[PDB]
Design a protein around this ligand. Sequence first.
Ligand SMILES: CC(=O)N[C@@H]1[C@@H](O)[C@H](O[C@@H]2O[C@H](C(=O)O)[C@@H](O[C@H]3O[C@H](CO)[C@@H](O[C@@H]4O[C@H](C(=O)O)[C@@H](O)[C@H](O)[C@H]4O)[C@H](O)[C@H]3NC(C)=O)[C@H](O)[C@H]2O)[C@@H](CO)O[C@@H]1O
Ligand SMILES: *[C@@H]1O[C@H](CO)[C@@H](O[C@@H]2O[C@H](CO)[C@@H](O[C@@H]3O[C@H](CO)[C@@H](O)[C@H](O)[C@@H]3O)[C@H](O)[C@H]2NC(C)=O)[C@H](O)[C@H]1NC(C)=O
Ligand SMILES: O=c1ccn([C@@H]2O[C@H](COP(=O)(O)OP(=O)(O)O)[C@@H](O)[C@H]2O)c(=O)[nH]1
Ligand SMILES: O=c1ccn([C@@H]2O[C@H](COP(=O)(O)OP(=O)(O)O)[C@@H](O)[C@H]2O)c(=O)[nH]1
Ligand SMILES: *[C@@H]1O[C@H](CO)[C@@H](O)[C@H](O)[C@H]1NC(C)=O
Ligand SMILES: [Mn+2]
Lengths: 642, 598
Amino acid sequence: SSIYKGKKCRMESCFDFTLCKKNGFKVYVYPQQKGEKIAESYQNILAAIEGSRFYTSDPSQACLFVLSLDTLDRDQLSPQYVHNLRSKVQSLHLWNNGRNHLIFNLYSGTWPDYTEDVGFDIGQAMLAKASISTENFRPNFDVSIPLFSKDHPRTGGERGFLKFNTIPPLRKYMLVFKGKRYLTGIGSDTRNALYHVHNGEDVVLLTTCKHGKDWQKHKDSRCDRDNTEYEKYDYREMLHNATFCLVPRGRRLGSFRFLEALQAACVPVMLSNGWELPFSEVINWNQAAVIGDERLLLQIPSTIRSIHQDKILALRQQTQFLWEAYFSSVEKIVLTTLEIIQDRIFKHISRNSLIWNKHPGGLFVLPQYSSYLGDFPYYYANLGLKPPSKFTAVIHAVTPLVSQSQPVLKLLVAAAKSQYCAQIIVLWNCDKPLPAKHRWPATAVPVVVIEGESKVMSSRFLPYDNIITDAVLSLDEDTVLSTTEVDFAFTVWQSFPERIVGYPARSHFWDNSKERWGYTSKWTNDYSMVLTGAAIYHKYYHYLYSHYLPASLKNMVDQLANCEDILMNFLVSAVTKLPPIKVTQKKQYKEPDHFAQRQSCMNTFASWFGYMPLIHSQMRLDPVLFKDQVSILRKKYRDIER
Amino acid sequence: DLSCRMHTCFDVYRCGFNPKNKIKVYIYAISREYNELLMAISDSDYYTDDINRACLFVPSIDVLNQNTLRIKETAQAMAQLSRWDRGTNHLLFNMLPGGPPDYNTALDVPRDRALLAGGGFSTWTYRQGYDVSIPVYSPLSAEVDLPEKGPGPRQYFLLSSQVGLHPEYREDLEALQVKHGESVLVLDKRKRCHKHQVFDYPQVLQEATFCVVLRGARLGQAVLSDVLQAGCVPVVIADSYILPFSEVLDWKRASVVVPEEKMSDVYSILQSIPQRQIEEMQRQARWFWEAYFQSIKAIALATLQIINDRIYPYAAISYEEWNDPPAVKWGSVSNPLFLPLIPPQSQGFTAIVLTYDRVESLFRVITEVSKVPSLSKLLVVWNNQNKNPPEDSLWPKIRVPLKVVRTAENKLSNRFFPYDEIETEAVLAIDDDIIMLTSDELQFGYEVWREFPDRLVGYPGRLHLWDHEMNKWKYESEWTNEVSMVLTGAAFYHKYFNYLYTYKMPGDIKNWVDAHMNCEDIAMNFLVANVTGKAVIKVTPRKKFKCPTHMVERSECINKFASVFGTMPLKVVEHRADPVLYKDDFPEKLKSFPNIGS
Ligand SMILES: CC(=O)N[C@@H]1[C@@H](O)[C@H](O[C@@H]2O[C@H](C(=O)O)[C@@H](O[C@H]3O[C@H](CO)[C@@H](O[C@@H]4O[C@H](C(=O)O)[C@@H](O)[C@H](O)[C@H]4O)[C@H](O)[C@H]3NC(C)=O)[C@H](O)[C@H]2O)[C@@H](CO)O[C@@H]1O
Ligand SMILES: *[C@@H]1O[C@H](CO)[C@@H](O[C@@H]2O[C@H](CO)[C@@H](O[C@@H]3O[C@H](CO)[C@@H](O)[C@H](O)[C@@H]3O)[C@H](O)[C@H]2NC(C)=O)[C@H](O)[C@H]1NC(C)=O
Ligand SMILES: O=c1ccn([C@@H]2O[C@H](COP(=O)(O)OP(=O)(O)O)[C@@H](O)[C@H]2O)c(=O)[nH]1
Ligand SMILES: O=c1ccn([C@@H]2O[C@H](COP(=O)(O)OP(=O)(O)O)[C@@H](O)[C@H]2O)c(=O)[nH]1
Ligand SMILES: *[C@@H]1O[C@H](CO)[C@@H](O)[C@H](O)[C@H]1NC(C)=O
Ligand SMILES: [Mn+2]
């Protein structure tokens, strides 16, 4: 560690593992001094870290420290550059040569020969710099982050551009580009040679020489012709009409053009040689982009035409997935950086490459639950595995057991008679003590009763070790069901394991009269929420609710004693990007303040997510031969109609 | 030189672009392992004879063994190769990068810019996109052919079979053995002995669930190949070491890595791995051995493939093509239309109607399909070469474009051609005798297809069952509580499925269906279930489609198709997607589709 404690820093030498030493991996942010100008982008990064689940206020507990000084822009000529930063960071008591420090940086270098002049001496801190060259990138230490402007959304999302997936996966043009060319300096070599390849039919490469205020002095013969054609085409309309969007190198290796290319669904053909692509340690960029060498600039159209239709289809879908998962907002970027850091501590608890490069993505797949891909409801097709044929019933009881006619008893035996059930868990969250053992009716499957330590609605979504099946049938105390209904719901779940399969569908909407989201429970022609009161879902969503969600939302849920099912559906629709499944015609599965709390919850969840992840759907999965004029001796699920 | 990456060190003027995206390798005119490596490279497609057209140069010098290297002489020979040119695009293979004075975890030759493919790489001596980490080939992999033991429970849980480990490692392992006992089988000094008890060294590794791999020197041991061959999940406790072919192989699914300092807690780490994950890791270890660790030929081919993927990133082979075992590959899916996007209702669908001597009923199809609000374009495939389409005045007046396409041949595959005249994503392939479908039913089918645009949303309900008596598949068409097929009499599906039928259907299924003029819908459903990996979605309770030797042919069709695919890609479901608020006590006006009933 003494030999390589410098530019050759790695996570196993220039990083103290003993500070985390537990399942708690926390990140600490230094206080702000109320005397320094702060750019809005670094403030957004700081707010995203502070609002995260990795944030703690105790420097002793945390094992990752974030500076409050603005290190985003290190260009001395930039208006957001902060002077006297070396002495200002060396005077920090917690610096410790920057041992567990993450430094966010977006720009570096002055006018002549732009380089990685970060300004101060970073020491041992890993820098999450934006435009990192390959030879200046520490592989298992640094994180290559995208270059984003100050207008990048804090928590929302542009939601991509590809709303049609039509074959053949080609558009009007094949390669497009419209940006400035620099007649003096470094980094315009690849931009001054685009007229060679420009043809005007499908390869449209537009440039303008107007840079700064003295561009007229150094102009040449070619600039007059090129500048005339510049106004012919609109840049936003151009990226949306090309199968591939050229993303060359400007002054620095990276550019805003990469993220716009990913968003516009056009597969980026990066011509920035020696650019460590954003999050390259976890993302395979051969699946979402074409990497073109700068030396072979003339052969680019040929290599582009050689790409087959299937490859183009895959590339477009993959770039859209990467945008929607990791690069959509600043919170996405910082959470991705923190999780990439986290995966490097406990090696046996990490996300395999199939997790990062596939739906739903690494943000929503937490290895602390299980590193086995079959323990998740998303990777059944990628393996040769079928959904498990057994499920565990969890009953949330809040009323005491006073009479044998209570609905919690008839429901417990109802789930037992099903051929798929493995066991039953009765979460007893009542003020009265636990009922007698003989009070539980005899069942084929074992019955386990757990008395909740904290009688809050978030306890019903805890990852209990007593659940031995990947599937969970979550029922309330007042849930009325038949064995046939449970069997049908589980069989339907077996085709859609990543969703929530349940009876009570509820919908959401936007109320323009109040400019806020609205919760609807009436019979509507469409739905986007099926409540957890009677629904089947993978048990990984329990871990997701327990850990991924912020403490504030769960605390509010506990305080109001409501909105647990709404939040669960929010999380499921966010992870899956698919609407939930409602089964059968069951309109009521039971038997003014509630609605207001639910609507406030919906608005709060939308504010935290930055958008509405719930997706409408106007179909339900009913049994074949349901209410069909056939002899009743042929149907399988006879009792559903009854 | 560590500051040597592809974008600067490599000379891409030598291999710009080829119609076949395979780089060319030249070999200049010696241990037997290197002879085998050169033979493997020579017989591959990468081999070329013209020096000018080559992109990679592999010298015919033994660099795998460094204990008898004579580094000065080897460096002088590398310079003397007369084509070194500062090692711009040369490749060197190594397996023992260490020195008796000190082990640098890299080759000690100058190698100013040459590509290195060495067994032992630390994260400091490794260039990310430049060098390739190769396995340390074990002669035991081919010298003794261990029986292919099936995955399952083993006599021992954790095991360690290494000779001459560091005393700290031995102390930690003995502490674990005395703390647990009868499970941690630490072995000492081609036979291993615990305490007066002898195990067969290659075959004892088959008696354990997890296997311990440590670092004594060169940072990479030959025991990894033996552990992979025996099937046990390897545990690597080298602090700073990258597993071979880590660029393309997913070792998180085939190994467990724990730091050297955190060795005393290895048992608690391993007990957190469920048994199913253990079986999967064992399968992946065996797959890695038979595909990459088996022979010097496999390692050489893997290295050349990785370097080719670096040179031509757009043509690199997939992750599944790298680390999915053949059983998994047969069971895998790799869905092409995977992006969870919901197409807007602003767009619509194109209706392909295949007609053959039903002119009176064909216009009924046109005026029934054209009434739906979301129809974009209507396409009629006139498959009869003896009767011309009626006069354009005879065609009915509709709100959407209608065009007719003449077919030079009479085939049932003419329904599934990717016509450039189709501009939308969805295709409503409907036969000429389908009239009973109302406008609302077709609109509901389209709406359900929007929520499920990667499947086959059909209105006919079919099934297939297994005939135990005859030991063969049996076509089914009776009204049953199980669906496996939806016929193309009314099917919403992606135009990519038309492309797949026309250009990618396996075997002679297209030819056979054209010859027998039957069973095109079955073939389409088979292809959709094979490529998408999930079953069809049947919509509506409607089952009848005719208002006013074939079946045995359908059974033969199913049997032949199952023979061609080698399995039954179809899946059985009970999904009859219906409109919500179906058959409820609700006003008819507010219902989305209040015209579904049969
Ligand atoms: C309880 C009660 O009163 N039930 C009545 C129903 O039984 C009755 O339905 C009848 O069921 C018959 C059946 O076996 O399902 C059905 O026979 C045929 O049904 C279809 C008629 O077209 C045939 O399906 C054809 O199969 C072809 C194929 O590819 O194999 C397709 O190409 C054709 O497009 C398709 O039409 C089916 O093969 C027939 N069955 C068999 C075993 O061959 C009777 O027609 C039907 O009457 C209904 C009718 O009103 O009433 C009650 O519900
Ligand atoms: C989708 O269709 C493809 C074929 O187009 C299926 O691949 C085929 O799957 C079968 C079933 O495993 C393979 O059969 C096996 O062959 C090996 C020898 O190759 C034999 O030893 C085994 O006993 C078994 O019979 C077949 O080889 C394979 N074909 C190819 C080219 O790989 C695939 O399984 C289908 N997928 C689904 C989900 O149905
Ligand atoms: O006509 C144009 C050219 C560029 N840009 C934006 O400018 C940025 C990069 O282009 P520019 O040439 O200004 O910078 P460079 O590419 O030279 O680094 C990106 O955000 C582009 O979206 C734009 O909006 N319109
Ligand atoms: O040589 C032929 C005969 C029929 N068809 C079409 O195939 C479909 C199936 O025919 P149908 O069910 O009407 O009768 P079948 O031939 O199947 O008994 C119809 O759309 C016919 O127009 C065809 O393409 N070629
Ligand atoms: C780019 O595509 C849009 C469709 O969104 C179209 O309106 C526009 O005309 C296209 N641009 C050109 C130059 O044709
Ligand atoms: Mn017919």
